[PDB]
Amino acid sequence: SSRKELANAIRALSMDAVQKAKSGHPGAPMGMADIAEVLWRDFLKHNPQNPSWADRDRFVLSNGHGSMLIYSLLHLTGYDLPMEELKNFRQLHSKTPGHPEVGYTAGVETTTGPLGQGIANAVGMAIAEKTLAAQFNRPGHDIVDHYTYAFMGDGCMMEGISHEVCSLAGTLKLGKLIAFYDDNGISIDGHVEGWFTDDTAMRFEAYGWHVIRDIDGHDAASIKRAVEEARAVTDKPSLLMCKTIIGFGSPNKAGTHDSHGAPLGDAEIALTREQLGWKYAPFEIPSEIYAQWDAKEAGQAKESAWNEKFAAYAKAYPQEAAEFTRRMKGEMPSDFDAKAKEFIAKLQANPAKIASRKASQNAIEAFGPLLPEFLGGSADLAPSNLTLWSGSKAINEDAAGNYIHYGVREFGMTAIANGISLHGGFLPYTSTFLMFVEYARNAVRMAALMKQRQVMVYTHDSIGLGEDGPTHQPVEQVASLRVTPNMSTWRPCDQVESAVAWKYGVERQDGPTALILSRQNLAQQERTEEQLANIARGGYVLKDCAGQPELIFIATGSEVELAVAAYEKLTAEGVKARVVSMPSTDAFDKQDAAYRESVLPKAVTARVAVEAGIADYWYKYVGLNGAIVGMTTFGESAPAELLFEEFGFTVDNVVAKAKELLHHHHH
Amino acid sequence: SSRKELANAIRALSMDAVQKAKSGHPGAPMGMADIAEVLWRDFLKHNPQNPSWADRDRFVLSNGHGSMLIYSLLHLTGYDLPMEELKNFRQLHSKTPGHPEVGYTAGVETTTGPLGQGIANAVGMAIAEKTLAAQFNRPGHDIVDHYTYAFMGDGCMMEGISHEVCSLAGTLKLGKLIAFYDDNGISIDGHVEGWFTDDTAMRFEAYGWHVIRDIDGHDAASIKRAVEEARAVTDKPSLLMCKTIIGFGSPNKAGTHDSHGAPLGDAEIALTREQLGWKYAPFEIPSEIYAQWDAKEAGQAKESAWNEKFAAYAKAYPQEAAEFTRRMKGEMPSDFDAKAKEFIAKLQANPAKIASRKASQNAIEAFGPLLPEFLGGSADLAPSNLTLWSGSKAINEDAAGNYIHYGVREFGMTAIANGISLHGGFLPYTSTFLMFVEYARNAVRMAALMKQRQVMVYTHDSIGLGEDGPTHQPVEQVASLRVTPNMSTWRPCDQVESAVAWKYGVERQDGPTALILSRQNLAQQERTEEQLANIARGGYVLKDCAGQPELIFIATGSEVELAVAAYEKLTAEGVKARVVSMPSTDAFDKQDAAYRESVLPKAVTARVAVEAGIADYWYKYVGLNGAIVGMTTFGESAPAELLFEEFGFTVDNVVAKAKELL
Ligand SMILES: Cc1ncc(C[n+]2c([C@](O)(CO)[C@@H](O)[C@H](O)COP(=O)(O)O)sc(CCOP(=O)(O)OP(=O)(O)O)c2C)c(N)n1
Ligand SMILES: Cc1ncc(C[n+]2c([C@](O)(CO)[C@@H](O)[C@H](O)COP(=O)(O)O)sc(CCOP(=O)(O)OP(=O)(O)O)c2C)c(N)n1
Ligand SMILES: [Ca+2]
Ligand SMILES: [Ca+2]
C-alpha cells in the first residue's frame, strides 16, 4: 500500500467510529493522519505487547479531542485494543472514552481533553528522560535513551500553559522533545485570524526552540525530512509547523469548522471514501494493511535488545540496576516505613514550635537521603516554600540533579509534574503559596483524575501570613481541595502531623497529596502512642473527658492550639469537652463507621469547628445544630496577630461561641 | 530639583515605609523610580482631585508587590493619600495595604498581587477605551481619548496569562496600550537565567507588538525618548524593555534577590541615603520637591478642558451624551426592570423545554437592545456556549461592536473582563464550559474581591453533557463558586429561572454572577405569581403539601424535574412532601429569616438534596440527619441518559433515599 492508503486507514476508522457513536471529533484525526503514519511507522520506538517498557518513546496527543487518532494508531499497530472497542467509542465502560485516559487503554500515556495540558505533560516526560539518563547512564551503558513526541493544535498554542512549559523546555534544552503543530487555521469559532494571529514560529524561536516552518502535513516525504532534522538537533526542543487541512478527505467539510467536532454524516462519509479511494466498509481493515501497520515484531526486537542491554548494565552496576527497577515500578525502599516512623517518633518526643512550612522542609531533609527518586521544585518560591534540602541539586546546573526551578509558572509546574509522575522513575513534589493553587487548579484535578502520586507543598495557608493581604490570604481554597474526588488534603497542626502527612503523601500510590502549611509557628501537641498512630487516620481524639462530651471542638492546622486553649478553659469550669484534630478530612472519611463514631459520636450534636478558612465547609461535620468559628469574608492587610483578633480567632471568642451554643441547646 | 532627585523621593519613601512596617518590597519601587518619574511627570493625563474622571489615562502596576511605588506616586502628585497613610503601610485598615486595592485608595485602578493579572486588566482597559471611542466619538468631538500604561516584571512575563492577553492585544491592534518591562534579571529564587531565558522582545514582536529594546531604565533621556516613540506608533501595543537594577541606590543589596521582598535594614538605608545623596529624614519631603511633583493644577486644567469638550458634544449629541454618562456611572436604564420582568412573565406563560444554555442566549437576545453597554464574548465556544445574539458585532471586525472572540484563553478572558468592568462604560459577559472555570479561577476570585459586575456564562454544567467524559464533566466546580466570598452563583432549572438569573447578574452593582447552564434540554416548571416572583429570592417552595412537611427535597438545575417526579410518587403514597428549587444559595442566604424558615423550616430535618455535583456541599442545608443524591466521583464517557442512571439520578433511587429518612 502507499503511505497515503495506510494513513487513510486512520481516516476511515476515525470518521466511522465517530459516526457510530453519533458523537466526537473527526476533523483533527483526518487532518493529522499523514503525520501520524510517518511518526508511528518510521520513527516511534515502542512495543505494542509491552506498553510499560521502561525505555519506550512517549507519545502525547495534546489536542485530545482527536481521540480516534490515537485509538486508530493503537489498534492498527497491534496493542490490546480490539475493533469491538472502537465500535464502542464514547460508550459506558469502553476502552475508548471521548478523550483519551491513562489506565483505560493500553498505550495511552496521559489523559487529555483540557487543552494545553498534554504539551505540559510531554515537557515533564522529556525532563524525566533527561534526568533519568543523567542519573543512571554509565560509560558503555546508555540504558535510558528515548524521545518524547507531542501533537498539539491552535487551542493548545493559545492557552497560557503552552507559554509556561515551552519557555521552560527551551531553558532546559530538551533535545529529545519533538512537537508537531497541527497548523490548520480553524478553531471552534471559525477561521482563527479573528482571534489568533501570532507568528508562532517566531514565538518558539524566542523560547530557544528549533522551528521547522511550512511543512506540507499531507506529504509523507516532507514530514519525514522534518522529523529527521528535529532528531539531528540535540540541544533544543523542536517544533514542526505542519500545514494541514482539518477533515482532509471530505469534499464538503474539509477546511471548515464543521469538521471539528461533530459526525460528518453518512452522505458525507460516502463522498469522503470516494475522494480518498478507500473501499473498505466501516470497521473493515484487510490483512495486507494490518501487515504494514503492525508493530509487534519490530517492537519485540527492540525491547529484547534493550533487555539485553539492561542485563549487561545489571552485571556491571548491580545496585544501580536494582534502583532503576525499583524506581520505574514506583516501589518504596524496603526500610523507608521504619525510618520514617523513627523520624515521626523522634519529633513527638522532642517538641519544637516551628511553622509547618519549616516542618515540611525538615521532612524533606529527613526523607531526601532515602528517596533518590525525589524530583522536587517550587514556582520561584524556594526560600519561602522551603523546598530545598541539603542534598538538593538544580537540574539546570547538573542534569543528574533532583530539583527544578520552575519560575513563576504554577499551572505549567503542576502539569509538568503530572508528566514526571506518568513517566516513571521519580516522585515529584511541587510548591507555591496555597492561593496560587488557583492558577494551577485544573492540573491539580488532573493529577487526582489520573491517580498520580505527587506531593503538593502549599504554604502560607491563611490570614496567618499577615501583611501581604487578601490577594494572598487563602480562605476558600482548602475547601475546594477537600471536595475534589481522589484528592488528599492535609492541614497539619504541628511538626509531628506535618511529618505524618509527608509520609502519607510519598506512600500514596494512587493519587496526589496536598500539604496545607503555615507561615507562622505552630505549637506541638502532646500525644500518647495511640494518638500518635491515629494521626494517619485523618481525624482523631486529641483531648477528651470522662463520659459523653457535652461539646466537641473540631479543629485543623494552626487552629488546634486555639481549640485546645478553649477546651482547657471550659474544662476548668466543669464543662465536659473533647477536642478532635482533623488534619485530613478525606482520610477521616475513608475510616470505617465504627472509628468515625468513636471520634464524632452521633449522640453529640454540640459541635464547634475552628479553622481560619471558609465556614460553609464545616456543616459537613457540625450539622445544623453546631457552631463554626471560621472565615466568611476575604482577608485584610495587617500583622497576622491583629488579623486573628479581628476575625475572631481568640480564646475568648471561641469560648463565648461554645457557651452560646450550649445555652441554645439547653433552652 | 534634578529628575534623579525627584525619582529619589520615591526611593526614600519606599524604603522608609517598608522599614517602618518591618514588611514589604523595596526592590521594584527603587528599581522603577526613574521610569515612574518620566511617565507620571511628563506624560500621564490625570487629575488627583478627581480619580474618577472618565477620560483619564489608566495606570496599572502589574508587579503589585512594589506597592510603595504607587503609594509614593499618589502621595507626591497630590491625591488624597496623606503621609500618615504611608506611615501606616501594611497596617490594619490603612489606605496603604501590602498590595494595591481598588476602592481602598484614591487613584488605584485595580487590585494586583497575583502576578500576570495586572497586564491582563490593562489589556481590558485598553479594549474598553478603543471600543468606547469607536461607539461615542463623532466628527469634531473626540470625547474618548486616553492611554493605558502598565508596569510589569519577570513574574508577569513568565505567567501564562501574559501570553494569553498580550497575544490578543496584538490581534486587536491596541495602539494606546504601552507596557514597561522591569528587566532587572532577578526573581525570588535569584538570577533568572536558571529558569527564564526567553528572548522577550522577539516573543512580543511575534504578538505584533512594537518593541523598544535596550532602554537604560535609570536615564530620564532614554526613557522619555522611548515613551515618545511608543506614543507615535498608533497601530500596535508597545513594550518598553527597561534595563533596571533592583534596589537601585543600595550599595550592598542593589542587583540582589535580597532587595526584592524584605526591609533593607537601618544600616543599609543609611548607606543608601549616602549613595543617592538624599539628605531628608524618613517621611520628610521638602516643599520644592512637592512643587515639582504636584499635579493638582495641571490635572484640574486638563479635566476642565475635557468637561468643556463634553458639554459641546452633549449639545450636538444629547441622547449619546446621556448614554455616555449613564454607562460610565454603571447605571441601568430606568425601564430595564419593567422590561425584563415582562420578558420573564412571557416565558412563564409560554412554556418551552430547552437547554439552559439556549435560555441564556434567549435572555441575551431580549436584553441586547436594552443594554448597549454589553461587551460580551466566549473563549472559542460561541456556537456551544451560545453567546451571540442577533445584534452581536465582533470588535475585530467593527471597532464599535459589542462582542469579543477571546480564543482559547479562559484566564486571560476573565482578567481582561475585569479590566473592562473597572474601566467604566461596559457590562462584560464572558463564557466557557464550566470545567474550564478552573483555568480562570483566580481571575473569577479577583472579580469578587474587587466588587466587579461581570456575568460569567458557564455551560455544560454536569454529567448531563455526556460523551466528552470526566475531563469535561463538572462535579465540584459549583461548590467552589458557592463558597467564594461575594460571588453569586445561579443554577437555573428552566428557561424562566435562567432569565431571572440573567436579570440578577446584570443588576448586581457590587460583584460578579456565575450562571451554571446545561447542555441538555430542561423541562419548564409551572409557577404561581408568588413562586415566579420568589425565583429572585434564590430558593423557593416549588411543590408543597398541606401543613408541616414530613420530607423536603432541595434541588437545583437539571435535577429539579427528578425531584418533582420523586415528590409525585411519595405524595401519591400519602407523604407530606415538599420540593424546594434552590437556583441560588447566596441569594437565598441573604433573605430574611422568616422567608428562609417558610422554605426550609427548622423543625423539618428530613431533607434530601438532589444535584449532579459534589455531595459534600449540601450538608449546609441537610445537616447530619438528611440525605444527598449527588456525585462523589469523577464522571465517565457515555451518553447523558446512561450516566444519570449509572450515578443514581433516577426516581427509584431518589425515592429510596427519601424512604430511608422516614
Ligand atoms: C482548556 C480548554 N478550553 C476549551 C476547550 C473546548 N474545546 C474543545 C472541546 O471541548 C473538545 O475537547 C469541544 O469540541 C467540545 O467537545 C464541544 O462540545 P459540544 O459543543 O459538542 O457540546 S476543542 C476546542 C477548539 C480546539 O481547536 P484546535 O485548533 O485546538 O483543534 P482542531 O483544529 O479543531 O482540531 C475547544 C475550544 C477545551 N477542550 N479545553
Ligand atoms: C501568581 C503569583 N505567583 C507567585 C507569587 C509570589 N511572588 C511574590 C510575592 O507574593 C509578592 O507579591 C512574594 O514576594 C511574597 O511577598 C513573599 O512572601 P514571604 O516569603 O515574605 O512570606 S513576588 C514574586 C517574584 C516576582 O519577581 P519579579 O521579577 O516579578 O519582581 P521583582 O523584580 O522581584 O520586583 C513571586 C514569585 C505571586 N505574587 N503571584
Ligand atoms: Ca485548529
Ligand atoms: Ca525581576
Rg of chain A over CA atoms, rounded to whole Å, is: 28 Å
What hetero molecules are bound to the protein chains? the ligand Cc1ncc(C[n+]2c([C@](O)(CO)[C@@H](O)[C@H](O)COP(=O)(O)O)sc(CCOP(=O)(O)OP(=O)(O)O)c2C)c(N)n1, calcium ion
Q: In which order are the strands of the major sheet of chain A placed?
A: 10-9-11-12-14-13
Percent strand of chain A equals: 5-15%
In short:
The structure is a homodimer. Chain A is α/β, with parallel strands linked by helices. Chain A has 27 helices and 20 strands.
How is the secondary structure organized here?
The structure is a homodimer.
Chain A: H1 3-21, H2 27-43, E1 58-61, H3 67-77, H4 83-86, H5 117-136, E2 148-152, H6 154-158, H7 160-171, E3 177-183, E4 186-187, E5 190-191, H8 200-206, E6 210-216, H9 220-232, E7 238-243, H10 266-276, H11 287-293, H12 296-316, H13 318-329, H14 336-349, E8 354-355, H15 356-367, E9 374-378, H16 382-386, E10 403-405, H17 410-423, E11 427-433, H18 441-449, E12 455-459, H19 477-482, E13 488-490, H20 495-507, E14 513-516, E15 521-522, H21 529-534, E16 540-543, E17 551-555, H22 560-572, E18 577-581, H23 585-590, H24 593-599, E19 607-614, H25 619-622, E20 627-631, H26 640-646, H27 651-666
Bound molecules: the ligand Cc1ncc(C[n+]2c([C@](O)(CO)[C@@H](O)[C@H](O)COP(=O)(O)O)sc(CCOP(=O)(O)OP(=O)(O)O)c2C)c(N)n1 (2 copies) and calcium ion (CA) (2 copies).
Describe this structure in words.
2 copies of one chain form a homodimer. Chain A starts with a helix and ends with a helix. The relative contact order of chain A is 0.09. The longest helix of chain A has 21 residues, at 296-316. In chain A, 44% of the residues lie in helices and 14% in strands. In chain A, strand 17, helix 22 (560-572) and strand 18 (577-581) form a beta-alpha-beta unit. The first copy, chain A, has 27 helices and 20 strands. Chain A is elongated and about 90 Å long. The first copy, chain A, folds into 3 domains: 1-325, Thiamin diphosphate (ThDP)-binding fold, Pyr/PP domains (Rossmann fold), CATH 3.40.50.970; 326-536, Thiamin diphosphate (ThDP)-binding fold, Pyr/PP domains (Rossmann fold, 3-Layer(aba) Sandwich); 537-667, Rossmann fold (3-Layer(aba) Sandwich). In chain A, helix 1 crosses helix 3, helix 14 (336-349) runs antiparallel to helix 20 and helix 22 crosses helix 27. In chain A, the strands form 5 sheets. In chain A, strands 10-9-11-12-14-13 form a 6-stranded parallel beta sheet, with helices on both faces. Chain A has a 5-stranded parallel beta sheet with strand order 1-2-3-7-6, sandwiched between helices. With 667 residues, the first copy, chain A, is an alpha/beta fold. At the A-B interface, helix 6, helix 7, helix 8, helix 16 and helix 18 of A face helix 6, helix 7, helix 8, helix 16 and helix 18 of B. One calcium ion binds at residues 153-154, 184, 186-187 of chain B. It is classed as transferase. Keywords: reaction intermediate, Calcium, Metal-binding, Thiamine pyrophosphate, Transferase.
